[PDB]
Amino acid sequence: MTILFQLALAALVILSFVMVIGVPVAYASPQDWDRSKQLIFLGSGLWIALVLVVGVLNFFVV
Amino acid sequence: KLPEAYAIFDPLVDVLPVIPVLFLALAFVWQAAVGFR
Amino acid sequence: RIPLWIVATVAGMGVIVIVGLFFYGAYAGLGSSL
């Protein structure tokens, strides 16, 4: 659970890092954001779940 | 201090507050790149 | 040919770093008070 918590929490960080850089260049260059509308959606969706994971999982470590 | 678990992230949170300033800076990076239109 | 905006932003951060190093030294070096 503890490591499982540090996994989710840390992964939530790297994803956000990828997301923060991703979304900009996505909407910017109109070379797509229709194939990236798939990528972005999966990242956004995943992000929320991760937050909820770390959320509940928090009351189990600390 | 930060809850025992998050303690690993203590160094990370040490820098977070300054981030907003960077945005003000970033806007200048952009304008420079776009050759100040 | 190296894009001007990159030259400035790199030399820019480079100045903030060295200058920020000076401000750190205000709390550690001989210029401290401890």
């Binding site: 850089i21 900009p24 260049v25 070379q31 | 990370l12 960077l22 990076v29 | -």
Partner: peptide, 28 residues
């Protein structure tokens, strides 16, 4: 001990999200 590793990445991140745009050329 040395969280300068953090700043560095998040610091170069800013110019990156527009540098990649100078490569893919568009919407600046």
């Amino acid at each position: 001990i040395a969280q300068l590793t953090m700043i560095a990445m998040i610091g170069i991140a800013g110019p990156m999200i527009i540098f990649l745009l100078a490569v893919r050329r568009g919407n600046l």
